[PDB]
Tab-separated table of N, CA and C in Angstrom:
chain	number	residue	atom	x	y	z
A	1	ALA	N	55.316	-170.368	-42.422
A	1	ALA	CA	55.198	-169.250	-41.493
A	1	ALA	C	55.931	-168.023	-42.021
A	2	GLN	N	55.915	-166.945	-41.238
A	2	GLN	CA	56.562	-165.705	-41.644
A	2	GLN	C	57.568	-165.248	-40.596
A	3	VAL	N	57.336	-165.614	-39.340
A	3	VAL	CA	58.190	-165.218	-38.227
A	3	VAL	C	59.022	-166.428	-37.821
A	4	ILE	N	60.339	-166.229	-37.731
A	4	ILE	CA	61.229	-167.314	-37.334
A	4	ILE	C	61.561	-167.213	-35.850
A	5	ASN	N	61.424	-166.017	-35.276
A	5	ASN	CA	61.833	-165.811	-33.891
A	5	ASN	C	60.770	-166.293	-32.911
A	6	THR	N	59.610	-165.643	-32.888
A	6	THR	CA	58.655	-165.797	-31.798
A	6	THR	C	57.384	-166.464	-32.299
A	7	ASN	N	56.809	-167.331	-31.467
A	7	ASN	CA	55.556	-168.020	-31.767
A	7	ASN	C	54.525	-167.551	-30.745
A	8	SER	N	53.806	-166.477	-31.081
A	8	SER	CA	52.816	-165.928	-30.160
A	8	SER	C	51.572	-166.806	-30.095
A	9	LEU	N	51.384	-167.672	-31.089
A	9	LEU	CA	50.285	-168.631	-31.039
A	9	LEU	C	50.431	-169.557	-29.837
A	10	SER	N	51.629	-170.118	-29.653
A	10	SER	CA	51.903	-170.921	-28.469
A	10	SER	C	51.757	-170.089	-27.204
A	11	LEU	N	52.062	-168.792	-27.285
A	11	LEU	CA	51.871	-167.913	-26.136
A	11	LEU	C	50.396	-167.816	-25.756
A	12	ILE	N	49.515	-167.693	-26.752
A	12	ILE	CA	48.081	-167.630	-26.475
A	12	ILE	C	47.593	-168.947	-25.885
A	13	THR	N	48.019	-170.069	-26.472
A	13	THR	CA	47.645	-171.363	-25.905
A	13	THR	C	48.156	-171.506	-24.476
A	14	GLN	N	49.340	-170.960	-24.195
A	14	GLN	CA	49.886	-170.997	-22.843
A	14	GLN	C	49.032	-170.186	-21.879
A	15	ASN	N	48.609	-168.990	-22.296
A	15	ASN	CA	47.698	-168.206	-21.466
A	15	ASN	C	46.400	-168.961	-21.220
A	16	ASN	N	45.987	-169.788	-22.182
A	16	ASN	CA	44.750	-170.548	-22.016
A	16	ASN	C	44.839	-171.523	-20.844
A	17	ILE	N	46.023	-172.092	-20.601
A	17	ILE	CA	46.140	-173.195	-19.644
A	17	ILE	C	45.950	-172.715	-18.209
A	18	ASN	N	46.523	-171.560	-17.862
A	18	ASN	CA	46.619	-171.175	-16.455
A	18	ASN	C	45.254	-170.840	-15.857
A	19	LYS	N	44.376	-170.211	-16.641
A	19	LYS	CA	43.052	-169.877	-16.125
A	19	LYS	C	42.252	-171.133	-15.806
A	20	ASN	N	42.380	-172.171	-16.635
A	20	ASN	CA	41.757	-173.448	-16.309
A	20	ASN	C	42.464	-174.120	-15.139
A	21	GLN	N	43.779	-173.917	-15.020
A	21	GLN	CA	44.535	-174.551	-13.943
A	21	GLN	C	44.130	-174.005	-12.581
A	22	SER	N	43.786	-172.719	-12.516
A	22	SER	CA	43.319	-172.160	-11.250
A	22	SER	C	42.044	-172.855	-10.779
A	23	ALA	N	41.066	-173.003	-11.676
A	23	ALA	CA	39.843	-173.720	-11.331
A	23	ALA	C	40.131	-175.186	-11.045
A	24	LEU	N	41.122	-175.758	-11.732
A	24	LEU	CA	41.540	-177.126	-11.446
A	24	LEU	C	42.002	-177.259	-10.000
A	25	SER	N	42.921	-176.387	-9.584
A	25	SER	CA	43.425	-176.423	-8.217
A	25	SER	C	42.296	-176.230	-7.220
A	26	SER	N	41.390	-175.292	-7.507
A	26	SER	CA	40.219	-175.119	-6.654
A	26	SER	C	39.417	-176.410	-6.555
A	27	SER	N	39.255	-177.120	-7.675
A	27	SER	CA	38.438	-178.329	-7.671
A	27	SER	C	39.067	-179.429	-6.826
A	28	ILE	N	40.356	-179.719	-7.029
A	28	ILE	CA	40.997	-180.738	-6.190
A	28	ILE	C	40.971	-180.331	-4.721
A	29	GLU	N	41.244	-179.057	-4.426
A	29	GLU	CA	41.237	-178.640	-3.028
A	29	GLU	C	39.843	-178.773	-2.421
A	30	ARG	N	38.797	-178.600	-3.234
A	30	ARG	CA	37.436	-178.701	-2.716
A	30	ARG	C	37.012	-180.155	-2.545
A	31	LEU	N	37.449	-181.037	-3.450
A	31	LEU	CA	37.213	-182.466	-3.250
A	31	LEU	C	37.906	-182.972	-1.994
A	32	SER	N	39.157	-182.562	-1.775
A	32	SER	CA	39.885	-183.037	-0.601
A	32	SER	C	39.260	-182.520	0.689
A	33	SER	N	38.937	-181.231	0.740
A	33	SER	CA	38.347	-180.656	1.936
A	33	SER	C	36.858	-180.983	2.016
A	34	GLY	N	36.341	-180.992	3.244
A	34	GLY	CA	34.917	-181.206	3.427
A	34	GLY	C	34.093	-179.973	3.110
A	35	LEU	N	34.728	-178.803	3.114
A	35	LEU	CA	34.038	-177.530	2.958
A	35	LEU	C	34.250	-176.958	1.563
A	36	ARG	N	33.211	-176.290	1.056
A	36	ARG	CA	33.324	-175.594	-0.221
A	36	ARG	C	34.130	-174.308	-0.086
A	37	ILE	N	33.951	-173.588	1.024
A	37	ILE	CA	34.588	-172.282	1.180
A	37	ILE	C	36.097	-172.435	1.324
A	38	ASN	N	36.538	-173.080	2.405
A	38	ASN	CA	37.947	-173.441	2.597
A	38	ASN	C	38.878	-172.226	2.521
A	39	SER	N	38.767	-171.331	3.511
A	39	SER	CA	39.647	-170.163	3.584
A	39	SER	C	39.452	-169.252	2.379
A	40	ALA	N	38.339	-168.519	2.370
A	40	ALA	CA	37.722	-167.999	1.156
A	40	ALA	C	38.546	-166.962	0.410
A	41	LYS	N	39.277	-167.415	-0.607
A	41	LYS	CA	39.664	-166.540	-1.701
A	41	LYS	C	38.449	-165.991	-2.437
A	42	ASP	N	37.315	-166.682	-2.346
A	42	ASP	CA	36.020	-166.247	-2.837
A	42	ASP	C	35.364	-165.358	-1.775
A	43	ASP	N	34.053	-165.136	-1.896
A	43	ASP	CA	33.352	-164.211	-1.012
A	43	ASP	C	33.598	-164.549	0.455
A	44	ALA	N	33.927	-163.519	1.238
A	44	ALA	CA	34.237	-163.724	2.649
A	44	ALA	C	32.971	-163.805	3.491
A	45	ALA	N	31.843	-163.348	2.943
A	45	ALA	CA	30.594	-163.372	3.697
A	45	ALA	C	30.204	-164.796	4.064
A	46	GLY	N	30.378	-165.735	3.133
A	46	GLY	CA	30.060	-167.122	3.428
A	46	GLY	C	30.916	-167.686	4.546
A	47	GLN	N	32.224	-167.419	4.498
A	47	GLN	CA	33.114	-167.909	5.546
A	47	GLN	C	32.763	-167.299	6.898
A	48	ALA	N	32.490	-165.992	6.924
A	48	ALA	CA	32.144	-165.337	8.180
A	48	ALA	C	30.844	-165.885	8.753
A	49	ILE	N	29.831	-166.071	7.904
A	49	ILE	CA	28.551	-166.569	8.395
A	49	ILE	C	28.682	-168.020	8.841
B	1	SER	N	25.274	-191.468	39.865
B	1	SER	CA	25.763	-192.364	38.824
B	1	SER	C	25.217	-191.972	37.456
B	2	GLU	N	23.908	-191.716	37.360
B	2	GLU	CA	23.366	-191.350	36.055
B	2	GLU	C	23.897	-189.989	35.621
B	3	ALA	N	24.119	-189.087	36.582
B	3	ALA	CA	24.694	-187.785	36.263
B	3	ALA	C	26.099	-187.923	35.692
B	4	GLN	N	26.958	-188.712	36.344
B	4	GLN	CA	28.317	-188.861	35.839
B	4	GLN	C	28.319	-189.555	34.484
B	5	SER	N	27.447	-190.551	34.294
B	5	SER	CA	27.380	-191.202	32.991
B	5	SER	C	26.965	-190.212	31.913
B	6	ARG	N	26.013	-189.333	32.228
B	6	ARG	CA	25.589	-188.326	31.262
B	6	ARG	C	26.703	-187.331	30.957
B	7	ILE	N	27.466	-186.926	31.976
B	7	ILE	CA	28.497	-185.909	31.764
B	7	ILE	C	29.565	-186.420	30.805
B	8	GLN	N	29.968	-187.681	30.948
B	8	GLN	CA	30.884	-188.305	29.997
B	8	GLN	C	30.290	-189.635	29.548
B	9	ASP	N	29.856	-189.691	28.291
B	9	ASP	CA	29.366	-190.923	27.692
B	9	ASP	C	29.710	-190.925	26.212
B	10	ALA	N	29.910	-192.126	25.667
B	10	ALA	CA	30.270	-192.237	24.259
B	10	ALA	C	29.136	-191.760	23.358
B	11	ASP	N	27.898	-192.142	23.674
B	11	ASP	CA	26.717	-191.752	22.902
B	11	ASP	C	26.875	-192.178	21.440
B	12	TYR	N	26.867	-193.501	21.244
B	12	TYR	CA	27.400	-194.117	20.028
B	12	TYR	C	26.842	-193.479	18.761
B	13	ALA	N	25.537	-193.200	18.743
B	13	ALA	CA	24.876	-192.770	17.514
B	13	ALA	C	25.493	-191.488	16.966
B	14	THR	N	26.115	-190.691	17.835
B	14	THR	CA	26.718	-189.446	17.373
B	14	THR	C	28.042	-189.694	16.661
B	15	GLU	N	28.960	-190.435	17.289
B	15	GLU	CA	30.306	-190.525	16.733
B	15	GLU	C	30.415	-191.615	15.676
B	16	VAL	N	29.429	-192.514	15.587
B	16	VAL	CA	29.439	-193.455	14.467
B	16	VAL	C	29.385	-192.698	13.146
B	17	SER	N	28.508	-191.697	13.064
B	17	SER	CA	28.461	-190.848	11.881
B	17	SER	C	29.789	-190.134	11.670
B	18	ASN	N	30.429	-189.693	12.757
B	18	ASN	CA	31.703	-188.992	12.631
B	18	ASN	C	32.788	-189.895	12.057
B	19	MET	N	32.894	-191.130	12.554
B	19	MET	CA	33.925	-192.027	12.039
B	19	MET	C	33.640	-192.425	10.596
B	20	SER	N	32.370	-192.673	10.257
B	20	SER	CA	32.050	-192.975	8.865
B	20	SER	C	32.392	-191.795	7.967
B	21	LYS	N	32.099	-190.581	8.436
B	21	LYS	CA	32.426	-189.375	7.691
B	21	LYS	C	33.927	-189.268	7.478
B	22	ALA	N	34.704	-189.537	8.530
B	22	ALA	CA	36.155	-189.439	8.436
B	22	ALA	C	36.723	-190.471	7.472
B	23	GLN	N	36.210	-191.704	7.513
B	23	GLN	CA	36.672	-192.716	6.565
B	23	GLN	C	36.325	-192.332	5.133
B	24	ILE	N	35.121	-191.796	4.915
B	24	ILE	CA	34.735	-191.371	3.572
B	24	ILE	C	35.656	-190.261	3.083
B	25	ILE	N	35.940	-189.286	3.950
B	25	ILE	CA	36.830	-188.189	3.572
B	25	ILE	C	38.236	-188.704	3.295
B	26	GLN	N	38.701	-189.674	4.083
B	26	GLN	CA	40.038	-190.220	3.871
B	26	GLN	C	40.133	-190.931	2.527
B	27	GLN	N	39.141	-191.769	2.211
B	27	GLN	CA	39.150	-192.461	0.926
B	27	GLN	C	39.037	-191.476	-0.230
B	28	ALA	N	38.192	-190.451	-0.080
B	28	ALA	CA	38.081	-189.426	-1.109
B	28	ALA	C	39.401	-188.693	-1.294
B	29	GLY	N	40.102	-188.412	-0.195
B	29	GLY	CA	41.389	-187.749	-0.295
B	29	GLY	C	42.425	-188.598	-1.001
B	30	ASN	N	42.473	-189.893	-0.679
B	30	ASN	CA	43.391	-190.780	-1.388
B	30	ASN	C	43.063	-190.833	-2.874
B	31	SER	N	41.774	-190.935	-3.211
B	31	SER	CA	41.375	-190.992	-4.613
B	31	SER	C	41.745	-189.709	-5.347
B	32	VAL	N	41.479	-188.556	-4.731
B	32	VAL	CA	41.741	-187.290	-5.408
B	32	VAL	C	43.241	-187.041	-5.508
B	33	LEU	N	44.015	-187.517	-4.529
B	33	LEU	CA	45.468	-187.426	-4.632
B	33	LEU	C	45.989	-188.286	-5.776
B	34	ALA	N	45.444	-189.495	-5.921
B	34	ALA	CA	45.820	-190.348	-7.043
B	34	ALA	C	45.443	-189.700	-8.371
B	35	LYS	N	44.306	-189.004	-8.405
B	35	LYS	CA	43.892	-188.338	-9.636
B	35	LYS	C	44.726	-187.090	-9.903
B	36	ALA	N	45.270	-186.479	-8.849
B	36	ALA	CA	45.949	-185.198	-9.004
B	36	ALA	C	47.445	-185.373	-9.238
B	37	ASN	N	47.993	-186.546	-8.907
B	37	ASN	CA	49.431	-186.735	-9.080
B	37	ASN	C	49.831	-186.746	-10.553
B	38	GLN	N	48.856	-186.850	-11.459
B	38	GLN	CA	49.167	-187.007	-12.878
B	38	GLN	C	49.391	-185.662	-13.562
B	39	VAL	N	49.159	-184.563	-12.851
B	39	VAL	CA	49.255	-183.220	-13.426
B	39	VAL	C	50.622	-182.951	-14.057
B	40	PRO	N	51.753	-183.278	-13.417
B	40	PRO	CA	53.045	-183.001	-14.063
B	40	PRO	C	53.414	-183.966	-15.180
B	41	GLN	N	52.618	-185.011	-15.422
B	41	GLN	CA	53.067	-186.093	-16.295
B	41	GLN	C	53.084	-185.696	-17.767
B	42	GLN	N	52.247	-184.739	-18.177
B	42	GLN	CA	52.087	-184.479	-19.607
B	42	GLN	C	53.313	-183.812	-20.222
B	43	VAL	N	54.274	-183.384	-19.402
B	43	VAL	CA	55.421	-182.656	-19.938
B	43	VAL	C	56.355	-183.594	-20.692
B	44	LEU	N	56.236	-184.902	-20.451
B	44	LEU	CA	57.179	-185.849	-21.041
B	44	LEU	C	57.098	-185.837	-22.562
B	45	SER	N	55.882	-185.882	-23.108
B	45	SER	CA	55.724	-185.850	-24.558
B	45	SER	C	56.118	-184.494	-25.124
B	46	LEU	N	56.023	-183.440	-24.308
B	46	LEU	CA	56.397	-182.106	-24.765
B	46	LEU	C	57.863	-182.053	-25.175
B	47	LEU	N	58.701	-182.874	-24.538
B	47	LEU	CA	60.144	-182.717	-24.674
B	47	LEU	C	60.634	-183.150	-26.050
B	48	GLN	N	60.169	-184.297	-26.534
B	48	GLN	CA	60.614	-184.805	-27.827
B	48	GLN	C	59.457	-184.877	-28.816
């Protein structure tokens, strides 16, 4: 390597995890609940209708 | 008599589906909780 201080490669891999983790949390919450919407962080039109 | 029975009656065919639905949701919740409890586990190999 060339840099002894910071590993921005691990930083990029770290950024990769959280975006998948959000969809992960959505998936478990949707499996547990009977409803797909479930207090819509997504479109509110579906929840209202 | 028929009026009072109609006003409050179990009407089995309706709530049988409800109880089956509730049991299915409960089992699904237990399964998904068992699948989701493993999320913090991967940090162990990270340490050493």
